[PDB]
Amino acid sequence: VVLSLSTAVKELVENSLDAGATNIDLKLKDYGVDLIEVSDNGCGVEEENFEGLTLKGEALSSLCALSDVTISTCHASAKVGTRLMFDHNGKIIQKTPYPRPRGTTVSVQQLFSTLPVRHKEFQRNIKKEYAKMVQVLHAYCIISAGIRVSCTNQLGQGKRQPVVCTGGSPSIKENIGSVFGQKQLQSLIPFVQLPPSDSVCEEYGLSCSDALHNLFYISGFISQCTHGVGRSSTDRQFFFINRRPCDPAKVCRLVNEVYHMYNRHQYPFVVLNISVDSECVDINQILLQEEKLLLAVLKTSLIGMFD
Ligand SMILES: Nc1ncnc2c1ncn2[C@@H]1O[C@H](COP(=O)(O)OP(=O)(O)OP(O)(O)=S)[C@@H](O)[C@H]1O
Ligand SMILES: [Mg+2]
């Protein structure tokens, strides 16, 4: 799964999160076309697993096949950090001692250079590819409370441009502020979950028995129903299932729709996390075992907030 620029950065960012990082700094050159560097203060890597970094689903090895990967890392238990250079077959070319703080820094140089067709497509469509990355990055930024995530992009030898930056704030609300400015917050109301209404249940084919296994816990923010306050498109709508950025099609349609019942010419800003038992999530598209109930809960709740 190194099929787009966004999927390459998401994979890297997730690695940092899983490593328990509280600081994740992403450096990009030429919109990532020349360099995508992710620096974190997570747990780092132990020497026993160096040879196992590009091996054993498993996109670190992929990145080596598609680009020149350099990794510096240091575990708490380590006396000294290490700098590693990998060839495209995921083999360690070089290995040298390197004093550095605990954490890992992964450098992806000349992404797709080994696939000349894909590499040029990536350059021509850079705008769209970059835009998509930025969306993914904003998601992880918003939901990652307590974690400082920063990103800069540098074009040519020009100055490093700011892309996004969070302050390690404890709430999602604060992250939204960091990412989009304090003016966006001001046109948002917090999500308030309500039991599914009798009428909304009626239209979904739900009954008194269908509504007790409700295990859905929803939280987040949405733009008010006030005239003008909305957006001009769906460019700022982020959905998450158990803190993981995803795209539940039906949930998205419902949200944008209930909003339109109040604001006809605008799309709302959306940040919604769907907390669920992980055993009720499938992959195939996403299947949530009780979608009707969730949809019911969503609509009821949105209706109650907007009135
Ligand atoms: N930032 C990091 N800090 C510490 N270890 C890392 C970091 N990035 C990668 N690794 C290590 O490299 C191995 C991982 O990655 P894969 O991306 O190849 O890993 P996965 O972590 O098993 O991820 P999936 O399958 O994408 S969910 C991991 O098991 C980690 O031990
Ligand atoms: Mg991974």
From Swiss-Prot:
UniProt-reported outcome of changing Q154P: In MMRCS4 and LYNCH4; uncertain significance; normal DNA mismatch repair activity
Disulfide-bonded cysteines: none
Binding site for ATP: N15, D40, E58, A59, L60
Highest taxon of the lineage: Eukaryota
Outcome of substituting C64G: In MMRCS4; decreased DNA mismatch repair activity
Effect of E11A: Decreased DNA mismatch repair activity; loss of ATPase activity
UniProt-reported outcome of changing L212V: In MMRCS4 and LYNCH4; uncertain significance; normal DNA mismatch repair activity
Subcellular localization(s) per the UniProt record: Nucleus
Function field: Component of the post-replicative DNA mismatch repair system (MMR). Heterodimerizes with MLH1 to form MutL alpha. DNA repair is initiated by MutS alpha (MSH2-MSH6) or MutS beta (MSH2-MSH3) binding to a dsDNA mismatch, then MutL alpha is recruited to the heteroduplex. Assembly of the MutL-MutS-heteroduplex ternary complex in presence of RFC and PCNA is sufficient to activate endonuclease activity of PMS2. It introduces single-strand breaks near the mismatch and thus generates new entry points for the exonuclease EXO1 to degrade the strand containing the mismatch.
Quaternary structure (record): Heterodimer of PMS2 and MLH1 (MutL alpha); this interaction is required for the stability of both partners. Forms a ternary complex with MutS alpha (MSH2-MSH6) or MutS beta (MSH2-MSH3). Part of the BRCA1-associated genome surveillance complex (BASC), which contains BRCA1, MSH2, MSH6, MLH1, ATM, BLM, PMS2 and the RAD50-MRE11-NBS1 protein complex. This association could be a dynamic process changing throughout the cell cycle and within subnuclear domains. Interacts with MTMR15/FAN1.
Stated family: Belongs to the DNA mismatch repair MutL/HexB family.
Name of the protein described by the UniProt record: Mismatch repair endonuclease PMS2
Source species: Homo sapiens (Human)
GN (gene name): PMS2
Residues of the full protein shown: 31 to 364 of 862
